[PDB]
Amino acid sequence: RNGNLKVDQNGMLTNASGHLVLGENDAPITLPIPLSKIEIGRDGTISVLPQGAPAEEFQAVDRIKLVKPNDQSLFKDTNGLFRHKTPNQPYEADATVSLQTGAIEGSNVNAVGEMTALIDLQRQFEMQVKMMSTAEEMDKSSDSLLRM
Amino acid sequence: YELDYYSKFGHTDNYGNLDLRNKPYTQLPSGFVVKGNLNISQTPIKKLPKGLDVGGSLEATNSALKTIRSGTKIKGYANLLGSKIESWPRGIKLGGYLNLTDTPLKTLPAKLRVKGDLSVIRTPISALPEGLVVDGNLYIGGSALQVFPDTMTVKGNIFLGGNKITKWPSNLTLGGAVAP
Amino acid sequence: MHPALWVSKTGLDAQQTNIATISNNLANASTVGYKKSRAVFEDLFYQNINQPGGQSSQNTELPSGLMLGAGSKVVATQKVHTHGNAQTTTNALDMMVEGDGFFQVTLPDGNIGYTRNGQFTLNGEGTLVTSGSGYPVEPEIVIPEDAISITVGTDGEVSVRVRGQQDNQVVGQLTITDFVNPGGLEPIGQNLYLPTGASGDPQEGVPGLDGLGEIRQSMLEASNVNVTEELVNMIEAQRVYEMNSKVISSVDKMMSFVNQQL
Amino acid sequence: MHPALWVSKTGLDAQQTNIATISNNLANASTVGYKKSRAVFEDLFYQNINQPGGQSSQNTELPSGLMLGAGSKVVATQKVHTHGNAQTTTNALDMMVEGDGFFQVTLPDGNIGYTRNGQFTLNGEGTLVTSGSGYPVEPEIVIPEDAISITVGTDGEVSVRVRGQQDNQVVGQLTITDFVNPGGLEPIGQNLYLPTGASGDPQEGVPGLDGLGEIRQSMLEASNVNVTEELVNMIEAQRVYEMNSKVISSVDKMMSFVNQQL
Amino acid sequence: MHPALWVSKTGLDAQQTNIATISNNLANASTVGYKKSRAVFEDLFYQNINQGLMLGAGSKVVATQKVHTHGNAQTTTNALDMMVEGDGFFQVTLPDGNIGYTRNGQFTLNGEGTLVTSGSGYPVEPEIVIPEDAISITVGTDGEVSVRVRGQQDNQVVGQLTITDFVNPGGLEPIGQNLYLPTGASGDPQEGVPGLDGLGEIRQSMLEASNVNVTEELVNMIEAQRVYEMNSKVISSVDKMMSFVNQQL
Amino acid sequence: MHPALWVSKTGLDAQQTNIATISNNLANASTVGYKKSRAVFEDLFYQNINQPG
């Protein structure tokens, strides 16, 4: 979900995490090296302008592969990429996903939700700690049984 | 399964020692490079990827290791006591000993050089290759060997381990002795 | 350390880099031809704790398949190479590029550095040099002493007016460089950029053909920083910084309770 | 968490949703044909903690019939479709609907989208399109290349003036759509709406008959947001946000006292 | 973080672009043949949460619409500056060789007498060359350029100007210097005699003044400033709310 | 610091030059063989955020 796209010196379209962006052909999107104006469409279409070309020669070269699968069937892997729980499952390219160009999507962490969860975890952890000391206290009393 | 870029990151310490003890991995990435020691003992790995480079020692005891591809480089030793390997490839860069005790090993490449001891204890190997040079001791106890190669160099003491030797090398420079 | 302590610390270091790159932008809020930078964050790797086998798809929704992150980091300080506004000055020696293009100056070590800053002047010999450290502009442009005015055309063709003869005599032609990935250029200070592998090979050509920009005389390129954007991102960076401080103290209090109670 | 902690947290989430709603209204304080949204709050269900059978109309004023709430929630973000003021412009291709009615445009998927924003232009072939994404307006209106003027009547009658011939040539006519429940329309951005089940079936017709609004040329409909309302709502929302924070802090201190003293 | 922080930031960015266009309109309040522009606002996508609950993402300026309304006329005594009475752009030849289309009419002569622009000196297509023997320059209402020659009855014709009209003038690409470039949405260059088939007529010794409404721009600055300050207060309020929470929670 | 600040600065300088041209004409209102002057305005470059068409 990181749309901080960039174009390397070879022309391949990647993001800030250094991941190759796929296209319609299911291959990394490679754009012509000497381009002059790159615009990403609402539907994911990539339109470029060659170096020194007139403004009426805009052409579409690729379309970003946008996928909308069931969220409950995805899991976060070790590298932050969401993948299918069932392996060897192809990712169908949905035609309903739309991209709003010129903006970056941040996180969705509810900080207050984390804070109230934090204070509850501390209290539950410090009542279990008291239980551990209570069990230790009860054992020392039983040691007096065998003192004779 | 297989080993990925991040799968191996969970089995590496500060000195790059890869520990795969009893891990359910079946293979390693092609052209694998390990800075330190590699431990694949008791693993279902059947074949090592080509171009493997180990900066430390190899340990695959009681594992399913059966095939090794040529060009593998090991700075330390290769401990394969109890593996399933059947044949040793030629061109392995090994800087330590080759422990093949309790292995189904049958054949060895010609002109093999071992910089330390060689143990083929309890192995069905039939004949040591001609030109075999060992810079340490020789262990052949419980093996099927009964005939030695014409020329071999064992810098250490050859230990027979019980098997009867009917033919001795014609050109043998031994720094130690021969024990039954 | 308790792993929860260092996870929160990476968030603190990530914001510290964010604060550093956000104070630099506001410091260069009046620098001519300055490109703003933004800190890009990305989460660190997740490790399987209850299943060392390394299969994160078996029972990921179960305690055995639990994965815990290692924090956050700033992966890059990305330069935003958007064109800036135009400053109309009276000096005839400062120039501007309309659109894509980079000026070329020769560094003391020999290689050339590329700049958007167009604040130029003349040295004692008369060559066109930078208004700061004084690095000459490639190609060399020497102004004759008898010249009374400098005219830089839209294609960089430098001509001077000399009395006793009509028509302006041409004494040089500027040439600008464009890059496939200008964001990969290495900033070295003094309004200079050095080419890198990620930027690509320099593409040199006349300023006005093959998609290159045009040289504008008596005009300067303002810094593209958005002072309001920096202030808004400054507000977020503080609050995220404070929140990671709260959890660190929360872990400290819990651990202090353990060895005080037990 | 503790029951008291989550009750206050729901109030914090509800106020967070409320502020983001009134933040949206202030951001869209200038967009043409914008309808403000207000967050509607509702109280969550009540639990009979002391009753093992869930019967309430026996002893509601006794400890047996005690019922405890679960907090609050935002049940909906209601769009207020109040008619906005008029902006008299000189561009003759932007238009306004006086009264109930929506313009209809053709989305790229083929489905028809509805808008109140009347900022329209022409495309390369003369078809009347929106001034933003460029979607065509249904029914298609093509302006001839030789037209010197464009006149849009109150009923959508698009006529043009052509030299060499008196009397205006009518090139088409616009139609507008009305909904039984305009508040049920799905906002999809771009000042565009999509029909839904809760909205009602589209009712196309002539703009000026059968109760539909009239098309006003060279005019625009300003957003109906009240900047004063949003500032007063911010004051109430911010204060309530702080009140629930003190409750959460109070519970934390209360539970901290229990395990510190006991 | 807090959604209200960045939703309000969109309003700050949207109004900043809006103010930039207003200042551009006021700056070009004396430019001949300048067309004023207004910023077109549109709301961002609405997200569906808690699942019928829609939350907006802010606002943005999606386009800068140029209003090609014909400006007033300035009567000048210069014989080389002209005007288009209606729809039509003068076509000039850029150094790249492509044709740029302009509505500014301040023209002059080069050293060789070719009619060029009074600024950068770009020639006007088709080339009109005024002979040295000419004593006056007359440009007809249909682009007919003629000069008065001493010793010869009747003005001799030295060329005929043509103008180009676009179906969508707002789709042209401004590149400065009162110049436009054809685009995909502009349409096709419709060239013909200046005065037939919807084309405007050439008016000599007249200039087309800017069409900006300086009164409107000042009122537009009033609402842009207040909405900009209105959105900043939400960010300030959200900042003090988040400061309160982590100080309290 | 702000795009509107830089845009309006160019407007001020343009009118500052424009006034100096008008003041010269009125100063030379009686000079023999003096030809009047008029300042020529033009708009600066346009930043291309979204390409029309």
CSV table of C-alpha atoms in Angstrom, one decimal, chain A residues 42-43 95-96 98 109-124 126-127 130, chain D residues 1-2 5-6 9 12-13 16 133 135 188 190 241 248-249 252-253 255-256 258-262:
chain,number,residue,atom,x,y,z
A,42,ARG,CA,-7.2,7.5,-12.0
A,43,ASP,CA,-7.5,3.8,-13.0
A,95,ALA,CA,-10.7,-3.2,-12.5
A,96,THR,CA,-12.4,-1.2,-9.7
A,98,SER,CA,-8.7,3.6,-8.3
A,109,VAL,CA,-2.5,3.4,13.7
A,110,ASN,CA,-5.0,4.8,16.2
A,111,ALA,CA,-2.6,6.2,18.8
A,112,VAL,CA,-5.2,6.6,21.5
A,113,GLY,CA,-6.3,3.0,21.0
A,114,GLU,CA,-2.7,1.9,21.5
A,115,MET,CA,-2.3,4.1,24.6
A,116,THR,CA,-5.4,2.7,26.4
A,117,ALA,CA,-4.4,-0.8,25.5
A,118,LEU,CA,-0.9,-0.1,26.9
A,119,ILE,CA,-2.2,1.0,30.3
A,120,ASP,CA,-4.5,-2.1,30.5
A,121,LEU,CA,-1.6,-4.4,29.7
A,122,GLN,CA,0.5,-2.9,32.5
A,123,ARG,CA,-2.2,-3.4,35.1
A,124,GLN,CA,-2.9,-7.0,34.0
A,126,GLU,CA,1.3,-6.3,37.5
A,127,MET,CA,-1.6,-8.3,39.0
A,130,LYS,CA,1.5,-10.1,42.5
D,1,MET,CA,-9.9,-3.9,28.7
D,2,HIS,CA,-11.6,-2.9,31.9
D,5,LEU,CA,-11.7,2.0,30.0
D,6,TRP,CA,-13.5,0.9,26.8
D,9,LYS,CA,-12.5,5.0,24.5
D,12,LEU,CA,-12.8,9.2,22.1
D,13,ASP,CA,-13.2,7.3,18.8
D,16,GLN,CA,-12.2,11.6,16.5
D,133,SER,CA,-11.6,14.7,-14.9
D,135,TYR,CA,-16.2,13.2,-18.1
D,188,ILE,CA,-17.3,9.2,-4.6
D,190,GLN,CA,-14.8,14.7,-7.7
D,241,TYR,CA,-12.3,14.7,23.9
D,248,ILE,CA,-9.3,6.9,31.4
D,249,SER,CA,-6.6,8.5,33.5
D,252,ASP,CA,-5.7,4.0,35.5
D,253,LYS,CA,-4.9,5.7,38.8
D,255,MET,CA,-6.4,0.4,39.3
D,256,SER,CA,-2.8,1.3,40.0
D,258,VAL,CA,-5.2,-1.4,44.0
D,259,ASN,CA,-2.1,-3.4,43.0
D,260,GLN,CA,0.3,-0.9,44.8
D,261,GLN,CA,-1.6,-1.0,48.1
D,262,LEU,CA,-2.9,-4.6,48.1
